[PDB]
Amino acid sequence: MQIGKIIKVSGPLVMAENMSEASIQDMCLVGDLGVIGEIIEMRQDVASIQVYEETSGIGPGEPVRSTGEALSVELGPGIISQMFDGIQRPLDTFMEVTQSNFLGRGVQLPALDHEKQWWFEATIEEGTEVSAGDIIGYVDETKIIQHKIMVPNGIKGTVQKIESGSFTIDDPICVIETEQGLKELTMMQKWPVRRGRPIKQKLNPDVPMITGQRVIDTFFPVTKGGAAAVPGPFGAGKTVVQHQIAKWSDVDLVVYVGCGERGNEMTDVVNEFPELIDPNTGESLMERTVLIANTSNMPVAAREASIYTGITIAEYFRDMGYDVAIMADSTSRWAEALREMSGRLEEMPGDEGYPAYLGSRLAEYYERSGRVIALGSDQREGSITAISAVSPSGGDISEPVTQNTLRVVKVFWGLDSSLAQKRHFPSINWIQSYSLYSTEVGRYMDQILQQDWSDMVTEGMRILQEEEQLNEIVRLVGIDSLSDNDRLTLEVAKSIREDYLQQNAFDDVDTFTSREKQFNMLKVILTFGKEARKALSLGAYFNEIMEGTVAVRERISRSKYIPEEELAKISSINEEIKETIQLIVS
Amino acid sequence: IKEYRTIKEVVGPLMAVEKVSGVKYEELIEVRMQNGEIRRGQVLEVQEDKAMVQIFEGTSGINLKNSSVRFLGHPLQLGVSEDMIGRVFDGLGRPKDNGPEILPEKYLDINGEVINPIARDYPDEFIQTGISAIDHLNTLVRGQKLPVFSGSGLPHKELAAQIARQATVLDSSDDFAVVFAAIGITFEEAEFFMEDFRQTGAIDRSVMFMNLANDPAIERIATPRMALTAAEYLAYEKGMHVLVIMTDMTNYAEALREISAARREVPGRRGYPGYLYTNLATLFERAGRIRGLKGSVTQIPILTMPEDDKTHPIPDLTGYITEGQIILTRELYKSGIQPPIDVLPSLSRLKDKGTGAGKTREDHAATMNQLFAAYAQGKQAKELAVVLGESALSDIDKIYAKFAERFENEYVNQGFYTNRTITETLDLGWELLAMLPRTELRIKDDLLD
Amino acid sequence: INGEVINPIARDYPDEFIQTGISAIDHLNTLVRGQKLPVFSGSGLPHKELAAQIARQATVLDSSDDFAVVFAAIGITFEEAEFFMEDFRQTGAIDRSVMFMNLANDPAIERIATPRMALTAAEYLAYEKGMHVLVIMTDMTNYAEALREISAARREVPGRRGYPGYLYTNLATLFERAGRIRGLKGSVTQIPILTMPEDDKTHPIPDLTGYITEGQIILTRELYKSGIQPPI
């Protein structure tokens, strides 16, 4: 293994001769101290290296060692439950081993535990022809998730020796006969974070994700393989929404990525996330989460690589046949790292100092998400769903980062602190929000429920949009100038906001609403509407309809709290509506 | 086919090869990486025995000493054939559809050739788009360039697919083909196009060039040039009337801007290179007709407008090269108007040479201007009429604004799956006008037929 | 004096309320122990006064110890500095303080060193000696101006609005030297102070500071001229 020598040091930029055995983008251990650097350029045998940690105290003469690879992740058992930085340093191993609260220059630690014994259960048989993504056996890594060991990309051939037993992730568990002879496989593979893990095919992300959060699942849904953006205004309950999706969604794993956050904000996530309880098991959510945590203090390259490191891990589990959600907060800070990196490379800036390639990088990320047929003879499916927070200074959505994002994703959940001000939660602005998946989801939904769901959703939304119109008429001038049909409309609208859109995350039952419960609840809201219309045309007046329906609207208000094993007491409200309204027709 | 194993420098996505010979400016290259990977590139500069190349897929992972460069001896070319019809390609014209072939007749520079000014013929005859607000008030002629100006969140994608399906020449005896260039769009956007085109069988007469958002910038920049080169072949060697549709031209300019920055150029006006005007002119001038030839090329560049600003480099510069423009607005779109065409700021500079008796029908010119003026005063009859509301409604001015209401919802709001023959368009033209008294009017011989 | 970066999973959430004794902060924009909360002001505006007041008055509601104040003056006039050093001497706030004074006619590199010196002192007092340290720094705008000067001298190429690409990292590098740490008695709370060039909120200095710190306190001219003190 060949060793360069530093010939120049000037700020973050180091140059070393005798590097010809290395490659553009290789990661480096620079100097005596051995700090992390990336080769940016090569002229003959001279490498220019962008160094990620302070170069203070380094000068000509000292060694440089190429790692032999671009920035990569270790992928194998031990990865679930960890907290990493943007470049996969293990933040807990860091504390035990260095006995320190500080991240010291050029301390190197493997991302995963290489010493831990795991039980490997072999599922494949000797003689079997295999290639990238075939499953050879599995590890029960956590109480929840089964880690499937796949044949790495690049390998093809015949299983020669496989066997169950206790192994560390370094031990050869399997030998493949290839055309180049015998290759040993371990339970781990490395992958470069800027290269998307290959797939058999990309599919349309057409299955709706069940978040159990009524405003999302119903009016602004995201499909498994879709992507949503969320603005991040202070005081609008973003964290609580993030948590609800992280824990209620019907995905197998969450990858959470914190890009380059304020120290104390990042500390918050680090504390709160481990306390999320997994709904089906009672175990920590961490038993199926991988967290990346970066403070704005971290190296710019770790802040920049955060999302890639994130997505690559998500891809690895996708390949196993799983549904993964990747949560990036906030991609605005990620982009700030991009901007810095651009200035460091003495580049031409684009708009507002952002590199010319901002949009590209965003696209590259989002297009690495989606529903796919993974490699392997199984042709199994998996998917990655992106939920990305944005936090444009002062809230301004019209800036570069949010603009380019809405140019490539399909769902926008617009959190709004004025809704928060009004105690309306989740503070998703139902006028400004959208989901370009609504139609396709409507179709699935109508099919799976045997019901006119699309119709109900669009009626619901038509009612809310009517309310925006009416509201302006009332403000200027007169609530007592509106027809009975409009006063009725306002009450149905109020019922959609208060009884449906408003969900309390901290309540046993309201915390999560099933697809079937969502349907009965909206069916009862809309049929109060329909029965009252019928009664109004039959010559009953508004005030009288209100007056005589106190009890039954109360039942509508408490719908959200009916347990799932009792959806009959929701259906039955329809009978109570009809019977009450028809009675009033006299 | 030269191969050199003598790479001297890599800086970002640029490499210097040395001890090279017979290499030409802009020649395509292949980099054979030490690990077996192959990347395409282009020679940016050639000096003595050196060549500087740009690698499309970038230069990450490359080990200089063990990589090699094949110099191919030609620039970016398209391999043309009649078998392009019904096939899908990417931005460099590689098959994307898993189909068979194709063995090209020949290879052409995607830059093309500049037409001798005496050889060019003036744009001539009606193309039917099936879209009233274009076919009537903003008519499209064979050989024209009429862009769609738009904006993020706008259904210009949907409009694009519709014209592609509904564009026809009625009648003629000459073939009619569509080249469709998608530039930097998402996989889902693409899948939507390939899905619609096949559902309706528009594919059977379309050639499709699909450039994705995550494709390298150089492929974005090349995509329309591949498309126009296919267009011109079909038009000028096969005698077809060819309609070229490209979305989204805004994506294209970002890509220029991205290449310009990589190549260490000083930016021009508002971020973009001075030569954005020139570059675009290279594209839009590639439309028209040739004296002595039957075929034509017609262009509908589609673009989204940043900040929704018409004076921005991108639409502005497009403006001076093209011949009118179809605007789409948010006010109309939000009213569920499909397509949301605002006809007032919309214009076709060439209508006159593609309408009237023989081309469309005798009443075209007049009905257009009558429907237009009536929509003009009708909208003013509401702009100042929300100021002073309907507490008192005018008898003439409130029969005008009802026209301004119905125009949008019945005449323009036709639907994205609705092909309206010109015959139909004009019949609905008059049907709406009969809301006004005769004294508010085309001419005396109106009620004639 | 560069220090070392705090392991993100080593930090503790800031918990405890700091009585600054200034209604507008304490009630409406509460400073909390371990927070980074800066003051954005302008030339002519009395941030100086506000700074001295927070330093005299800041206390926790606990049983201690008292705050130790580490005060870093950065590129300020002799007048500014002489105000501080007399107030601290007058009140006896000095017996509780560590002062780093660096004036406008001081070499721009020393300007650059000043905050790094102060923070090194603060972390030592806090994380090795178990003290609760309150770090006040004026005027960060000056730190920035000094940055451009050295940067120009090293022949670097400026990013957004004339300032260096690396400005962000530099700034975070200062302001993230703060907070409570698990298992440690002491803590560092920062109140960086800065004048906004041409009162421009979007200027890189105030903009980037905002991305890094946990909020900000603004003084306006409309308030100051109207004799309001503190003009928050």
From Swiss-Prot, chain A:
Which catalytic reaction applies to this protein?
4 Na(+)(in) + ATP + H2O = 4 Na(+)(out) + ADP + phosphate + H(+)
Query: Where, by residue number, does ATP bind?
Result: 232-239
What is this enzyme's EC? 7.2.2.1
Q: Which GO biological-process labels does this protein carry?
A: proton motive force-driven plasma membrane ATP synthesis
Q: Which UniProt keywords apply?
A: ATP-binding, Ion transport, Nucleotide-binding, Sodium, Sodium transport, Translocase, Transport
Any single GO CC term annotated in Swiss-Prot or TrEMBL for this entry: proton-transporting ATP synthase complex
What the entry lists under Pfam families is as follows:
ATP-synt_ab, ATP-synt_ab_N, ATP-synt_ab_Xtn, ATP-synt_VA_C
Induction or repression:
By increasing intracellular Na(+) concentration.
An example of a GO molecular function for this protein is: proton-transporting ATP synthase activity, rotational mechanism
Gene3D superfamilies recorded: 2.40.30.20, 2.40.50.100, Bovine Mitochondrial F1-atpase, Atp Synthase Beta Chain, Chain D, domain 3, P-loop containing nucleotide triphosphate hydrolases
Q: Which superkingdom, per the lineage?
A: Bacteria
Q: Where are the transmembrane segments?
A: none
Report the family membership: Belongs to the ATPase alpha/beta chains family.
The record's section on PANTHER family has: H(+)-TRANSPORTING TWO-SECTOR ATPASE, V-TYPE PROTON ATPASE CATALYTIC SUBUNIT A
Name the job this protein performs. Answer: Involved in ATP-driven sodium extrusion.
Protein name as catalogued:
V-type sodium ATPase catalytic subunit A
Curated annotation (Swiss-Prot), chain B:
UniProt-listed InterPro entries:
ATP-synt_VA_C (IPR055190), ATPase_a/bsu_AS (IPR020003), ATPase_F1/V1/A1_a/bsu_N (IPR004100), ATPase_F1/V1/A1_a/bsu_nucl-bd (IPR000194), P-loop_NTPase (IPR027417), V-ATPase_su_B/beta (IPR022879)
Its BP terms in the Gene Ontology are: proton motive force-driven plasma membrane ATP synthesis; sodium ion transport
Q: Which UniProt key words apply to this protein?
A: Ion transport, Sodium, Sodium transport, Transport
Q: Any idea which GO molecular function terms this record carries?
A: ATP binding; proton-transporting ATP synthase activity, rotational mechanism
Q: What induces it?
A: By increasing intracellular Na(+) concentration.
Q: Please report which protein family the annotation says this sequence is part of.
A: Belongs to the ATPase alpha/beta chains family.
Q: Which HAMAP family match?
A: ATP_synth_B_arch
Q: What job does this protein perform? A: Involved in ATP-driven sodium extrusion.
User: What is the official name of this protein in its record?
Assistant: V-type sodium ATPase subunit B
Gene symbol? ntpB
